[PDB]
From TrEMBL, chain B:
GO terms for biological process: ATP synthesis coupled electron transport. One of its GO terms (molecular function) is oxidoreductase activity, acting on diphenols and related substances as donors, oxygen as acceptor. Keywords: Cell inner membrane, Cell membrane, Electron transport, Lipoprotein, Membrane, Oxidoreductase, Palmitate, Respiratory chain, Signal, Transmembrane, Transmembrane helix, Transport. The chain holds residues 24 to 285 of 315 of the full protein. This is Ubiquinol oxidase subunit 2.
Length: 186, 262, 660, 99
């Protein structure tokens, strides 16, 4: 009996479903990108240094999770919860910057209720941020479960599925920064 | 129905529309009639109750039958696909008609549960009724003032959608003088059953000039966008109305209510 | 106690809606009093509501389907009545306000709650028993998917008594369904009714795609599975790919409605067309998501009652795979009239017409199965021959409407409803009844009554013809969709004929009930005591009358394409294994129905703008997810005493049957 | 997400490059929009592949070779929609103008 294998395969298939979910919003941002209504454009609100620092925090997070997984496969509990704490803190930095910027936007009359461009922008970037905060929740609950139950079977399968999820979040962010922010700032 | 609006049409476009329909039908019959016929035939000749039949319990693969069950449908669809390419390129609603005239331009606005018509070259507008001389291309520009509608005159030709903030193009022609019913073929809310209009094909150009003359004498006028917004107020089963004067470029102004350009 | 919700949300004035509400709540009182009279509460809880058995869950799926078919057909009959009357110069009884609600609700129900669960439940029943597995890859997920379907149904039926339902048609076109043009709550019901339900369906699709690959029995290469699994597998793939599109489209529309975004609005940058493009990208896969499983069914029956091996097995699997692929490059043909040029139209019309060869190969292989067999005229094969005949004509009309120059005239006319009703009722409902009459003994131990079922089938086929084949002629003479008032009188006769057919269908449906009743009443004489009531071919028939909670006590080992038949043939088909082994199985959980209750509360609060309770609902649902991840009492072991007991029972029954 | 740590640090370095270069390329304005767009797209697809190899350990062996066929499948579907959509709407816009 090896149920972790099928659990991980099923999570892979869910992640493919998620890739579809995201491609639809990508196509949306494509079709309404220049659909501003006498308002700001991507070149006028995107400050690139911000975006690159967000990127590097996410990338760092993805690396610390890889190392956490390795610590699992070498049977260290403290190591796993440590790399996990670090990953969660970097992801927290990511969402913190994101909420700062979104609020600075809406408080200057540039929320998603001003043009089909700003609406699609909020859709895509908030869809990514929501996946990331969901992953943050998952990571915390799994961390307290690890601290109180040790490196059991369930916990290991759960680490693998959260690994898939975090890596895929970063992979979607590569595209979000290449197609939205960079291709606009250009 | 032979006397149908589609199977006995009166405009050229609908004419080729029907010819297309019938060749497609008679092309598909070749593999759908044998299907049903064989279905009942085998149902009977191989009923368990039969005896003389040849019951082969292990005949599961004949390459002959696979070949012929792949060979005929592929051919039919090749022919249909060629016909579809050609016809689709030959009946795009946005394509002028080849005939020695000057097309009459009509502008079509889908008001809440009403059809608005503007003759710009004539300076008139009518509610729920249009007219144009038979044997003369009619160029329809189409926009929706409210929610997605579909302008359609069945016995003359093709339908086309109507969106707010966009322009659409249709070209139709009438081969015989008479009155034809047109309707909105996309649901649009509470008074969708009353979106019926009547389109006339006058015999001569004279009678057409007389109908323009008639409209020219109305006590009403659509000059300010105020009157447009006055008329566009929600209403139902509107009576056919005429208007004397017309803000020159009012179709464009409507479309601009929703800001399209480029 | 708060929100838009008022005492002025229920039709207190309406004679029709209010009598229906009174009758439905009286009938609820009725079933409650009955169940608490008997004392079957605990039994329901511990056997059906919390079950992680694919058999039980499939049964409840089909129950929901059958009991919402009633609302669907009620609405259809009312619509036909209103039309036949408005044709005659009469006011009628259904204003547009109501009429439009009715057609929206009816389309939605019959597509999402009748058609979808019927197929998904037959799958749930027969796919694990066919591949030789003890359960599905994910049991608790099965429970939760069923209950998300139930939440959707509860919402779409609450809308009837409190508030109204969307007056926009079943796909909720954007401009009409925006906050400006439809300020009322009817669209909102439509929005959370499906979204929640969708969150379930997707899981179910994911759920099976894993099973059919990972949880098979040893020795069954993929080219040995029964055709139903192949088709089911194809259907699951399409679900996984398709339903995320619907998720995101409905999400963008709720954003448009709740926060003032401009995705499909008219002003401020939005574009309505994009919606029409997106939803049909999901809409066209979904019809296939339905025609593909039923297809499998017919194959199975074609092979059972003709009593020979399916013809062109490989060709059938390659046909279904090609269909799966090509089902993603034809959605544009649902809006040929929205203005796209000649090239986009030509391309997509071709790609739609190229989708025909697969299904044609399928029906010809079905026919050449029957060719030199022995056809036993059971109710199921009647359904099958009728499917062939009807679906042929339906698909022919469809091909003809895939030519854009013809769609230019026939778009949205009654021709469209004629054709798509043809294929759904012909291809879909026909096959789901075929499937219930085929696999009823495998689920309860007795056989349905043949006479009333034959009566039902004949009424259904004759009534479908006399109902819908006048609509081909009607859509030919100009009559369009969804008209309710002052209808042109030159449509009267045909419409007055259509209603006649509808009556006939009622009788068929009436027959169904009688067919069910006289069956259960007489369950103690018409039992399948072997497990093989038809001379079947696949593995499901090798099990018990009603199979054991674990499908097989010792996973079979396959060696050929039809597993059970070749076992029946060698001389070795009922061979008690030597030593029985403990079986590891999953437990029953009440957590899923609780997530689902919180989800219902959440949706109903979002629809009536009660924000604190929407918050409590979401909160509770996610919280419950987080608390069910803690407890590990999730599986148990079945000892050998019970396995020996049950298998001794079944082999006693068998030795008695071969005995006499 | 288990492998040697040296591989993970190599992937870190490669992705650090494949991020840093596009950003300097676009903000300073080194070349023309065509070279810019080409290089940014290319480098993005290369970072995606590097993450899916070293960070996701995606093989053609695991799960009977169905992990890959799944992935590839999704790609195609995405290509079918994202492009298809973009095409359709693009056209549907030009045929809605005040010509
Ligand atoms: C059961 C569900 C179902 C299925 C399976 C189908 C399968 C098909 N449909 Fe239908 N459809 C279905 C339910 C709908 N269709 C619709 C909309 C629709 C439209 C666009 C609507 C419009 O014109 O505006 C077209 C062109 C079709 C054509 C087809 C075709 C060509 C197939 C083909 O795959 C089936 C063809 C099968 C055949 C042909 C079998 C017979 C073949 C033989 C005998 C061999 C001969 C070979 C050849 C002729 C090549 N469908 C809509 C939209 C509803 C709405 O507008 O609200 C619905 C609900
Ligand atoms: C326009 O809309 C339409 C019409 O309305 C005009 C038609 O009438 C119709 C007629 C259609 C039918 C009769 C369909 C046939 C129905 C069938 C077969 C029944 C289906 C069987 C079922 C078991 C349905 C499932 C039911 C549920 C999941 C539960 C739903 C719960 C509901 C509806 C609760 C409603 C409760 C209320 C309204 C209580 C109101 C309380 C008050 C007013 C308090 C007042 C008290 C004081 C003191 C003032 C429809 C529905 C159509 O939608
Ligand atoms: C995928 C779908 C993505 C979801 C998109 C979310 C859309 C949000 C729409 C917001 C509507 C406007 C609500 C509003 O007016 O709130 C104003 C208020 C301002 O906050 P203020 O008092 O100025 O200072 C707080 C400092 N902490 O509060 C604020 O608005 C500022 C905080 C905004 C929070 C940003 C995070 C939301 C993004 C979710 C993604
Ligand atoms: C909005 C979009 C919502 C998208 C939700 C995405 C769901 C992601 C689940 C993906 C799981 C697929 C892989 C299957 C798997 O391995 O997960 C584990 C479990 C299956 O294993 P199981 O059968 O449960 O074994 C017994 C364990 N107790 O399967 C499980 O995952 C456990 C079940 C968890 C499902 C909880 C769903 C919560 C519903 C929240 C809806 C929020 C709606 C908000 C309004 C928008 C609509
Ligand atoms: C608004 C909606 C916002 C949604 C927020 C979602 C928050 C959910 C966080 C979930 C945290 C609980 C996870 C508990 C857990 O341990 O899961 C482990 C599980 C592995 O499987 P197993 O061991 O069997 O555990 C099943 C027991 N429940 O692994 C799992 O199956 C957990 C799966 C969690 C994946 C969540 C994915 C969320 C994706 C967001 C979709 C948003 C789409 C919106 C865009 C539409 C446009
Ligand atoms: C796909 C998923 C789409 C989800 C759409 C969410 C819509 C948000 C509704 C809030 C509308 C609003 O104007 O806020 C009302 C109130 C003031 O502000 C509030 O405090 C209302 C809070 C609403 C909570 C919703 C939680 C759902 C997750
Ligand atoms: C689901 C309903 C099934 C209820 C259980 C049926 C049963 O146990 O028998 C009750 C009743 C007795 O019928 P006989 O036996 O005499 O059986 C009946 O004759 C009445 C069953 C009515 C079912 C109607 C089907 C629709
Ligand atoms: C694992 C995967 C995880 C999930 C992946 C999410 C999906 C990511 C898909 C990437 C989206 C590609 C977006 C293409 C660019 C969109 C666009 O707006 O270009 C349209 C272009 C006209 O130029 P335009 O961009 O409008 O003007 C400059 C505006 N700054 O007009 C054009 O002609 C551009 C056409 C280019 C077609 C690009 C198709 C890319 C397909 C990628 C397949 C992925 C699978
Ligand atoms: C009892 C047999 C059925 C009858 C008599 C029936 C009747 C009707 C009628 C009269 C309409 C509207 C016709 C019009 O617009 O003029 C309709 C629409 C529809 N029906 Fe059916 N139907 C039946 C079964 C089904 C089934 C099994 C499905 C499964 C999908 C279904 C799905 C739909 C859909 C999606 C619509 C379109 C809803 C809309 O456009 O608003 N119907 N039906
Ligand atoms: C929102 C609420 C959600 C509702 C969920 C539905 C839950 C209802 C479960 C009721 C099932 C109880 C059956 C117990 C009888 C028995 O097994 O013995 O004695 C008997 O044998 C009676 C047999 C009764 C058969 C009734 C089947 C009708 C449904 C058709 C399904 C057929 C499947 C075809 C394969
Ligand atoms: Cu379709």
């Amino acid at each position: 009996h090896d149920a972790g294998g099928t659990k991980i395969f099923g999570f892979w298939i869910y992640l493919m479903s998620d890739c579809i979910l995201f491609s639809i919003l990508f196509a949306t941002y494509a079709v309404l990108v220049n659909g501003t209504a006498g308002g700001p454009t991507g070149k006028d609100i995107f400050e690139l240094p911000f975006v690159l620092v967000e990127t590097f925090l996410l990338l760092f997070s993805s690396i610390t999770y890889g190392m956490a997984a390795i610590a699992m496969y070498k049977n260290n509990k403290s190591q796993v919860i440590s790399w996990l704490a670090l990953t969660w803190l970097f992801g927290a930095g990511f969402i913190g910057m994101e909420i700062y910027e979104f609020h600075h936007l809406i408080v200057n009359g540039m929320g998603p209720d001003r043009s089909g461009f700003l609406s699609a922008f909020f859709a895509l970037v908030g869809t990514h941020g929501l996946h990331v905060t969901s992953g943050l929740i998952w990571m915390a609950v799994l961390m307290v479960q690890i601290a109180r139950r040790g490196l059991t079977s369930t916990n290991r399968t759960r680490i693998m599925c959260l690994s898939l999820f975090w890596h895929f979040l970063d992979v979607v962010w590569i595209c979000v920064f290449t197609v939205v922010y960079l291709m606009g700032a250009m | 129905g032979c006397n149908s609006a589609l199977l006995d049409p009166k405009g050229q476009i609908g004419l080729e529309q029907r010819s297309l329909i019938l060749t497609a039908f008679g092309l598909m019959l070749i593999v759908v009639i044998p299907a049903i016929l064989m279905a009942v035939g085998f149902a009977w000749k191989y009923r368990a109750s039969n005896k003389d039949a040849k019951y082969s319990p292990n005949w599961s693969h004949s390459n002959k039958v696979e070949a012929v069950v792949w060979t005929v449908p592929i051919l039919i669809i090749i022919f249909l696909a060629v016909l579809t390419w050609k016809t689709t390129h030959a009946l795009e609603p946005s394509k002028p008609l080849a005939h020695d005239e000057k097309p009459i331009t009509i502008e079509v606005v889908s008001m809440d549960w009403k059809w608005f018509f503007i003759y710009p070259e004539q300076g008139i507008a009518t509610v729920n009724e249009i007219a144009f001389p038979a044997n003369t291309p009619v160029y329809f520009k189409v926009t929706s003032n409210s929610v997605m509608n579909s302008f359609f005159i069945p016995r003359l030709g093709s339908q086309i959608y109507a969106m707010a903030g966009m322009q659409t193009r249709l070209h139709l022609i009438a081969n015989e003088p008479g009155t034809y019913d047109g309707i909105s073929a996309s649901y649009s809310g509470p008074g969708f059953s009353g979106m019926k209009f009547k389109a006339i094909a006058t015999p001569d150009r004279a009678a057409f000039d007389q109908w323009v003359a008639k409209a020219k004498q109305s006590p009403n006028t659509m000059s300010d966008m105020a009157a447009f917004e006055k008329l566009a107020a929600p209403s139902e089963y509107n009576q056919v109305e005429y208007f004397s004067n017309v803000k020159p470029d009012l179709f464009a102004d409507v479309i601009n209510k929703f800001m399209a350009h480029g | 106690m708060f929100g838009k919700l008022s005492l002025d949300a229920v039709p207190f004035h309406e004679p029709i809606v209010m009598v229906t509400i009174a009758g439905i709540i009286l009938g609820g009182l009725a079933l409650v009093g009955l169940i608490t009279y008997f004392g079957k509460w605990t039994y329901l809880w511990k056997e059906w509501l919390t079950s992680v058995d694919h058999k039980r869950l499939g049964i409840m799926y089909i129950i929901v389907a059958i009991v919402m078919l009633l609302r669907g057909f009620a609405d259809a009959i009312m619509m036909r009545s209103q039309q036949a009357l408005a044709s005659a110069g009469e006011a009628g009884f259904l204003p547009p306000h109501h009429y439009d609600q009715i057609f929206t609700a009816h389309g939605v129900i019959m597509i999402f709650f009748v058609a979808m669960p019927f197929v998904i439940g037959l799958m749930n029943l027969v796919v694990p028993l066919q591949i030789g597995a003890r359960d599905v890859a994910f049991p608790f997920l099965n429970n939760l998917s069923f209950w998300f379907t139930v939440v959707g149904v509860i919402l779409v039926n609450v809308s009837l008594g409190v508030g109204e339902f969307a007056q926009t048609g079943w796909l909720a076109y954007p401009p009409l369904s925006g906050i400006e043009y439809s300020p009322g709550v009817g669209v909102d019901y439509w929005i959370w009714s499906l979204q929640l339900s969708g969150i379930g369906t997707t899981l179910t699709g994911i759920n099976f795609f894993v099973t059919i690959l990972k949880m098979r029995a040893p020795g069954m290469t993929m080219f040995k599975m029964p055709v139903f699994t192949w088709a089911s597998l194809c259907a699951n793939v399409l679900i996984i790919a398709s339903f995320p599109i619907l998720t995101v489209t409905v999400a963008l529309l709720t954003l448009d409605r709740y926060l003032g975004t401009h995705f499909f609005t008219n002003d401020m940058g939005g574009n309505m067309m994009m919606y029409i493009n997106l939803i049909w990208a999901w809409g066209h896969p979904e019809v296939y998501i339905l025609i593909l499983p039923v297809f499998g069914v017919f194959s199975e029956i074609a092979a059972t009652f003709s009593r020979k091996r399916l013809f062109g097995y490989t060709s059938l699997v390659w046909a279904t795979v090609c269909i799966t692929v090509l089902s993603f490059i034809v959605w544009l043909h649902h809006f040929f009239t929205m203005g796209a040029g000649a090239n986009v139209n030509a391309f997509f019309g071709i790609t739609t017409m190229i989708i025909a060869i697969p299904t044609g190969v399928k029906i010809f292989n079905w026919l050449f199965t029957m060719y030199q067999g022995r056809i036993v005229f059971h109710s199921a094969m009647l359904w099958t021959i009728g499917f062939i005949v009807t679906f042929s004509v339906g698909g022919m009309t469809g091909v003809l409407l895939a030519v854009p120059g013809a769609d230019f005239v026939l778009h949205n006319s009654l021709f469209l409803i004629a054709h798509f009703h043809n294929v759904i009722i012909g291809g879909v409902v026909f096959g789901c009844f075929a499937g219930m009459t085929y696999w009823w003994p495998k689920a309860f131990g007795f056989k349905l009554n043949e006479t009333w079922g034959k009566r039902a089938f004949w009424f259904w086929i004759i009534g479908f013809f006399v109902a819908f084949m006048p609509l081909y002629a009607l859509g030919f003479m100009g009559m369009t969709r969804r008209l309710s008032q002052q209808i042109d009188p030159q449509f009267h006769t045909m419409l007055m004929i259509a209603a006649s057919g509808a009556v006939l269908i009622a009788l068929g449906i009436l027959c169904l009930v009688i067919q069910m009743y006289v069956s259960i009443r007489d369950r103690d004489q018409n039992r399948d005591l072997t497990g093989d009531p038809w001379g079947g071919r696949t593995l499901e028939w090798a099990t018990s009358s009603p199979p054991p909670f674990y499908n097989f006590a010792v996973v079979p080992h396959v060696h050929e394409r039809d597993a059970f038949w070749e076992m029946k043939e060698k001389g070795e088909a009922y061979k008690k294994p030597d030593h029985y082994e403990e079986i590891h199985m999953p437990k029953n959980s009440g957590a899923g129905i609780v997530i689902a209750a919180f989800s219902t509360i959440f949706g109903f609060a979002m629809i009536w703008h009660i924000w604190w309770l929407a918050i409590v609902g979401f909160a509770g649902m996610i919280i419950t997810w987080i608390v069910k991840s803690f407890d590990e009492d999730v599986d148990y072991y079945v000892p050998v005493a019970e396995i020996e007991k049950l298998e001794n029972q079944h082999f006693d029954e068998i030795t008695k049957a071969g005995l006499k | 997400s288990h492998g040697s740590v040296k591989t993970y640090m190599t992937g870190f370095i490669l992705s650090i490059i494949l991020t840093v270069i596009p950003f300097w390329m676009v903000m300073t304005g080194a070349a023309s929009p065509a070279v810019i767009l080409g290089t940014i797209l290319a480098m993005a697809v290369v970072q995606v592949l590097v993450h899916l190899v070293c960070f996701l350990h995606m093989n053609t062996k695991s799960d009977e070779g169905w992990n890959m066929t799944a992935f590839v499948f999704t790609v195609l579907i995405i290509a079918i929609l994202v492009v298809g959509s973009i095409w359709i709407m693009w056209n549907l816009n030009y045929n809605m103008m005040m010509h």
